[PDB]
Amino acid sequence: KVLTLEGDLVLGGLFPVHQKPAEDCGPVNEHRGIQRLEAMLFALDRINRDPHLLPGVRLGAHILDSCSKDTHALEQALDFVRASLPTAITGVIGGSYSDVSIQVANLLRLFQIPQISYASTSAKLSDKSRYDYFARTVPPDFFQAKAMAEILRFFNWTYVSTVASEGDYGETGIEAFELEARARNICVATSEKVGRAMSRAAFEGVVRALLQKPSARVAVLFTRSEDARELLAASQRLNASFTWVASDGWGALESVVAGSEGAAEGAITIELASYPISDFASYFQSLDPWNNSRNPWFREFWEQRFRCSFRQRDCAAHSLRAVPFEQESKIMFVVNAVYAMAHALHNMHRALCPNTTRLCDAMRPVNGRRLYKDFVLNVKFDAPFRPADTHNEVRFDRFGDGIGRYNIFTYLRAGGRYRYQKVGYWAEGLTLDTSLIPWASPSAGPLPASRCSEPCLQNEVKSVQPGEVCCWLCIPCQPYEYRLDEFTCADCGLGYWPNASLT
Ligand SMILES: N[C@]1(C(=O)O)[C@@H]2[C@@H](C(=O)O)[C@@H]2[C@H](O)[C@H]1CSc1ccc(F)c(F)c1
Ligand SMILES: *[C@@H]1O[C@H](CO)[C@@H](O)[C@H](O)[C@H]1NC(C)=O
Numbered sequence: 001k002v003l004t005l006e007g008d009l010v011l012g013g014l015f016p017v018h019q020k021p022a023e024d025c026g027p028v029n030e031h032r033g034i035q036r037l038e039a040m041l042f043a044l045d046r047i048n049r050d051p052h053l054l055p056g057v058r059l060g061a062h063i064l065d066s067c068s069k070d071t072h073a074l075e076q077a078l079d080f081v082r083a084s085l086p087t088a089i090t091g092v093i094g095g096s097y098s099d100v101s102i103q104v105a106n107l108l109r110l111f112q113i114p115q116i117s118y119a120s121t122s123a124k125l126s127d128k129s130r131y132d133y134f135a136r137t138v139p140p141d142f143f144q145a146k147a148m149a150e151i152l153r154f155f156n157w158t159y160v161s162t163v164a165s166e167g168d169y170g171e172t173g174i175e176a177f178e179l180e181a182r183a184r185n186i187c188v189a190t191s192e193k194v195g196r197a198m199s200r201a202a203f204e205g206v207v208r209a210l211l212q213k214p215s216a217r218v219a220v221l222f223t224r225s226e227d228a229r230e231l232l233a234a235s236q237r238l239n240a241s242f243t244w245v246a247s248d249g250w251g252a253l254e255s256v257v258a259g260s261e262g263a264a265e266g267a268i269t270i271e272l273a274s275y276p277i278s279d280f281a282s283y284f285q286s287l288d289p290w291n292n293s294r295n296p297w298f299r300e301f302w303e304q305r306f307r308c309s310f311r312q313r314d315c316a317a318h319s320l321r322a323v324p325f326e327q328e329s330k331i332m333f334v335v336n337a338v339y340a341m342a343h344a345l346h347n348m349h350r351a352l353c354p355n356t357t358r359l360c361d362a363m364r365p366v367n368g369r370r371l372y373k374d375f376v377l378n379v380k381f382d383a384p385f386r387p388a389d390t391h392n393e394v395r396f397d398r399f400g401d402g403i404g405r406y407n408i409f410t411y412l413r414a415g416g417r418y419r420y421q422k423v424g425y426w427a428e429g430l431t432l433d434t435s436l437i438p439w440a441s442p443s444a445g446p447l448p449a450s451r452c453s454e455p456c457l458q459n460e461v462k463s464v465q466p467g468e469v470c471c472w473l474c475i476p477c478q479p480y481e482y483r484l485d486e487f488t489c490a491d492c493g494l495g496y497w498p499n500a501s502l503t
Contacts, residue, residue: 001296002079003037005044007060008359009366010087011341012080012113013040014073014094014104017065017297024072025065028301032096035284035328036118037063038295040093042283043338046384053339054346056357062089065297066096070103077104081111089113090345090366091376093337096330098122098168101134109133112368114376116340116400118333123172126399133368135376135400137336141169141247142176143404144270147426148220148245149180151268151408154430157243158470159452160218161210162188165227165249166195173222173247187470189216189452194227203227203234211240217450221246229256236263243448244411248272252409252420261418266439266448267411273425274332275392277385281327285320332383333402336394339384343394344375351375376400404428410437458502462487477502 003013017033018025028034044061047053062080066073073095080089092108092115095101101120108115109132117125117136125131126140152160162177164170170193178188190213192206210219219242221228228250235242236259244267250256251271257264292298299310305323308315348371353360377400383392395403408424424432434440439448452471456462461483462472477489483502484490492498 003061003063003296005061007058009057009090009345010060010062012089012092013061013063014066014092016068016096018067020068024069025067028304030301030305031328034297034301036331036334038284039280039331039334040338042280043335047342053342054349057349057359059342066100068097070099073100074103074107077107080113081107084111088365091341093341095120098125101125105131105134114368114372116337118337119330122168126401128399133372135396137333137340137402139402139404141173144247144406145173145177146180147270147406147430148177149184149186150430151245152186152218153184155447157218157450159187159189159216159450160220161190161216162220163192163194163223163231165223166193169224170222177220177222187468189213194223194231203230204238206231207234207238207240215452217448218243218245221250223249225249225253225256229258232256232260232264236260243450264411265413269409271407271409273405273407274329275387276327277331277335279385280331281325285325287320335385336383340379340394343379343381344371348375408432412438461489
């Protein structure tokens with residue numbers, strides 16, 4: 001099964017239609033697969049009826065299933081390229097998973113095929129020596145580490161402990177954080193990692209490790225949802241008071257804060273900022289297995305979601321209408337990637353084919369290099385189906401990374417039941433309404449400020465510790481010594497004595 005829609009230019013598409021033994025393909029991914037695949041189809045449908053976006057050129061599709069596996073994505077992604085090894089794939093919209101996009105980016109570069117991922121967030125994909133044909137509507141997770149460092153440097157939380165989940169996400173994220181911390185003069189009290197299958201009592205060890213240096217109340221979490229939950233419970237179980245500053249791993253999930261509400265309180269969490277797209281909800285909820293023949297996996301998905309069968313007769317009776325619709329996090333990015341391609345091709349067409357709306361000879365075939373370098377990257381448009389309020393834009397930096405805009409959430413105790421409130425955002429600079437954070441807003445006691453050392457006295461000079469540069473002991477100058485610097489005393493002589501003001 002492969003999805004093929006006839007068009008003048010054809011877009012390839014990659015979605016993890018199935019989850020990952022001899023089986024590359026398991027259950028239907030009803031949200032990251034079916035919902036996002038249907039969103040690309042939805043976008044094409046609209047582009048194809050839009051008179052300002054390629055009126056003459058009809059966009060086709062050749063959609064493939066990655067099966068949430070790089071190797072299965074590559075076998076499939078061969079379809080895209082054999083069209084040059086007689087209509088070709090003009091550009092690929094896809095890779096949900098980063099490993100999936102890296103695999104497909106390594107193949108498409110050899111055929112100058114532009115590619116826009118709508119979910120691959122690996123910092124690795126920003127390397128244009130490797131991925132020169134790759135852009136993404138979603139920004140790398142290394143941007144949320146920059147924002148985290150900006151939060152601590154604002155609250156002046158200089159001595160902080162850091163926790164990272166074992167993987168590409170945890171390791172690369174925390175590394176970018178430490179780098180942004182060092183340039184903002186923030187010291188890592190204790191670096192910590194959290195492996196895959198760590199036991200209930202194992203995660204409790206990590207809490208005692210962070211408490212070994214108890215002067216740092218701020219814990220910077222760059223963990224996966226699974227770890228951020230198990231660590232929060234091992235913090236509550238041992239009853240540990242921590243000022244969490246977490247990544248979108250934790251995000252604004254009611255799932256992460258389970259039973260450990262009081263322990264999670266005051267936590268600052270970052271979460272990639274999206275909105276539900278208009279019209280897709282009713283597009284999707286109106287899909288039925290009889291009329292949606294074009295999507296080969298729709299009948300497969302139907303039987304899954306409603307737990308019915310074609311032979312069992314009671315299958316058509318259901319509708320995606322009866323079940324309340326929850327629009328997948330990255331739907332917005334899918335549709336922006338499809339429009340970023342539709343626009344790039346449109347602008348290229350406006351430049352190469354000025355005497356016709358028809359696809360001219362200068363674009364038969366499309367030079368993918370000219371398409372990626374001169375049109376995909378230079379795209380700048382008002383995001384399609386954006387909320388009526390917003391003036392949300394679609395553009396890419398030099399490396400094709402999405403323009404990184406995130407939401408900041410604090411954990412609150414509503415008068416009782418515990419919730420998350422958006423306190424600020426990170427556009428290209430941190431912004432946050434401090435009156436919306438409870439441990440700041442009423443000036444109810446001093447800030448939770450985490451520092452290893454408090455400042456030295458008048459008669460004291462701060463002697464720094466050979467290790468960490470943010471730590472010092474308060475050593476006093478001899479009575480025959482005055483305070484020259486703030487880390488150095490000096491002899492007054494032989495007959496001379498220091499001034500009552502350490503001068
Ligand atoms: N951005 C992804 C990528 O593959 O780069 C892509 C997502 C998608 O298509 O929804 C898949 C993965 O979930 C994610 C891994 S990064 C990641 C971010 C937040 C976490 F909490 C976590 F644990 C890992
Ligand atoms: C952080 O430190 C600066 C410089 O001492 C100070 O002006 C600022 O008010 C501090 N911010 C907070 C919120 O503590």
